[PDB]
A paper describes a structure:
The large terminase protein is a key component of the DNA packaging machinery in tailed bacteriophages and evolutionarily related herpes viruses. Crystal structures of the large terminase nuclease from the thermophilic bacteriophage G20c show that it is most similar to the RuvC family of the RNase H-like endonucleases.
Initial crystals were obtained from a proteolytically cleaved C-terminal fragment of the full-length protein (Crystal form 1). This metal ion is coordinated by the side chains of D294 and D429 and four water molecules in the canonical octahedral geometry. A similar coordination is observed for Zn2+, although there is also a second Zn2+ ion bound at an additional satellite site, at a distance of 4.6 Å from the site A Zn2+ ion. In our structure, complexed with two Zn2+ ions, the Zn2+ ion bound at catalytic site A adopts an octahedral geometry, resembling the canonical coordination of Mg2+ that would support catalysis. However, the second Zn2+ bound at an adjacent binding site, not previously reported for the RNase H-like endonucleases, is coordinated by catalytically important residues D429 and H427. Binding of this second Zn2+ ion perturbs charge distribution in the active site and may affect DNA and metal B binding as well as water nucleophile formation and coordination.
Author numbering: 257 to 296, 298 to 411, 426 to 442
Write the structure that this text describes.
């Protein structure tokens, strides 16, 4: 891939399906986690749980055709399940609507509105560099790998963006 020149170094994790969740590891209370969150109607929302101690994705949740409140409900549940993992949320949409609903549901988040190509490239370039270094590990799932393999800046990229938002927190 032109953007992800380090695709061969991506670590491919075994996982168990649990509905909309791909689960690599259950919550370890001795580890700290964050979540990268992208929001979609028939477009997908994707929430990626990163173990900040290992640098590996512990869980990835993906859904479409779910109502706005159900999406936010799933995000709240996933955060809570991994120790109220803080959420790096793409809050860019109509007004402050996304942030309002996250604040109203008590979700622990940091806003990172992907409002321009500069912000998108900042996130994707970081993911790509970590991947080159062998530091990105994701569930070995066809849908995830296809989005990464077929990624172009200008054909869904919601998984890519969610992963990039999570890995923005990893040194
Ligand atoms: Zn290859
Ligand atoms: Zn809670
Ligand atoms: Zn999409
Ligand atoms: Zn998206």
């Amino acid at each position: 891939n032109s953007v992800f020149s380090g695709l061969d170094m991506l670590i491919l994790l075994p996982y168990e399906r649990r509905g909309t969740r791909l689960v690599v590891e259950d919550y370890r209370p001795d580890h700290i986690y964050c979540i990268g969150a992208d929001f979609g109607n028939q477009d997908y929302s994707v929430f990626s749980v990163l173990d900040l101690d290992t640098g590996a994705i512990a869980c990835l949740e993906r859904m479409n055709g779910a109502t706005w409140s159900d999406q936010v409900a799933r995000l709240k549940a996933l955060s809570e399940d991994y120790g109220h993992a803080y959420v790096v949320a793409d809050t860019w949409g109509v007004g402050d609507a996304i942030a309002e609903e996250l604040d109203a549901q008590g979700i622990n988040y940091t806003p990172l509105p992907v409002k321009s190509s500069s912000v998108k490239e900042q996130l994707i370039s970081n993911l790509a560099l970590l991947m080159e270094k062998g530091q990105v590990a994701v569930p070995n799932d066809k849908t995830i790998l296809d989005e990464l393999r077929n990624f172009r800046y200008y054909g869904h990229d919601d998984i890519v963006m969610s992963l990039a938002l999570a890995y923005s927190q990893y040194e």
